[PDB]
UniProtKB/TrEMBL annotation, chain A:
Residues 46-64 have a biased composition (Polar residues). InterPro entries: Phage_coat_Gp5. Residues 35-64 are annotated as: Disordered. It comes from Shigella phage Sf6 (Shigella flexneri bacteriophage VI). It holds the Pfam family P22_CoatProtein. This is Gene 5 protein.
TrEMBL record, chain B:
It comes from Shigella phage Sf6. It comes from the Viruses. The chain holds residues 153 to 304 of 708 of the full protein. This is Gene 3 protein. The gene is 3.
Amino acid sequence: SQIVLKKFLPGFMSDLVLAKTVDRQLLAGEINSSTGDSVSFKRPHQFSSLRTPTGDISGQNKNNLISGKATGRVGNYITVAVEYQQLEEAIKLNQLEEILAPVRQRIVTDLETELAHFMMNNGALSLGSPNTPITKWSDVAQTASFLKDLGVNEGENYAVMDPWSAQRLADAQTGLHASDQLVRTAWENAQIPTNFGGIRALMSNGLASRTQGAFGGTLTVKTQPTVTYNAVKDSYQFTVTLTGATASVTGFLKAGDQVKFTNTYWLQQQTKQALYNGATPISFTATVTADANSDSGGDVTVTLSGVPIYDTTNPQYNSVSRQVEAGDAVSVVGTASQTMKPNLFYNKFFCGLGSIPLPKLHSIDSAVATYEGFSIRVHKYADGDANVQKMRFDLLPAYVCFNPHMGGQFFGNP
Amino acid sequence: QRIAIEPIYDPSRSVWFDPDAKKYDKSDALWAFCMYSLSPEKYEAEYGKKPPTSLDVTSMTSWEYNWFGADVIYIAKYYEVRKESVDVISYRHPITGEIATYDSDQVEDIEDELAIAGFHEVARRSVKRRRVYVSVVDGDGFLEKPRRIPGE
């Protein structure tokens, strides 16, 4: 019970597919020592047309030029540190090189879990009830159809699903009738192809999960919010109040819940016409940003991502069939307090990602380690005088959301 | 054009060969790496200042040494050998020798031959040839896109 092999046993590892698909080009090397703590990008312009019998545009009002912004900011530090007594570790363990392996994997795995939360928290679009899993071919093609119907062309669309869900689609694929290669591939390797239903399907086992949060009562909007373009031209976030809730519950609406407005429908952003889902028009939806409680009298104040712009003096920026006013009926999708692992579908230009280089800390031994293109700074110091050494590995991430209306969550439907 | 001989500094931490080669001269190798250090100012001088610098990680040196200069970026040159299909054109002009086979790179319009001393004759035999490509890469992507070098 003394001799031990010098080779370590293998362990477990997750995968990276989300960080590879998100945009890492626009926000890269832009947060420098001159820019400051934040940087912003411009927004496209839209115009309206006036129809008259003979010109005479004198009476009406010409289009007004309003400029938007999309600011990106930095996050907190990703830090892993160890502390030890050197004699004991130096017995048979090399320079904490056994530590060297699974630390970068921890730092990178955390960056991807934070990306998953950011995208789920700040997405807008939603499809299907959260309860049903993915079993059939239409459940994947609906996302591509919806994105194409909205009007996004410049970019590239992706969809991410659980490991178990992919097998069910392969089981459907093995049931095909005429494609020899597809049937053989699905029978042998149980691998679905690249282009699935007009969108690229991807399989990931490391994906964040969320809790619904208890709610009850037929909710309704109490006061008309401000949804003009001037108010929401910088963030696409607005504040709304709800009534008819429960008596007094904490954590009434968790972060990531979808709130659906029944009587206000989506619009094709270019032609400004309603959206029809084959048999019923598509309703507007938004995502909660932060946790919200309920006070006595059922008054819930919540901040949502995704805005139903219905400006009357600037009609060119409308994004909803009709204005939300007091007395409208809303609903929350999902059950009372269940926990599920959602699936994400998004465009290429939905969220950004970047890294901030960190300079060497003065008079301290250091090095730089690379992992999937991510640089990690490591430092070693000896604060304390009791055979006590210290190590630390760090990364600073920067996240940006361009337009919430090009991504969200999707589930199966019955 | 000219052939040049250049030195390589710190070969023990810069040159890495295909692990499938066993000969002394590494003739049976399909790819190799050649690493070298660089400064941020010279990194910005070439390439572009727009993308931040990402360097290769080896965790090789700093083994019992005090390090003070964090202004070094590690860039590597990547070599590939490929077998590709190339069309050889045999200009069979009888004057001053007849049998002359040339690759598709040199063309009557790319090279100012203009059939003055060349007859097109046969230009359809396609043969596989051994070619070598070079590229410059870092920890992020391609600093220079691959291009073929004149050799075997």
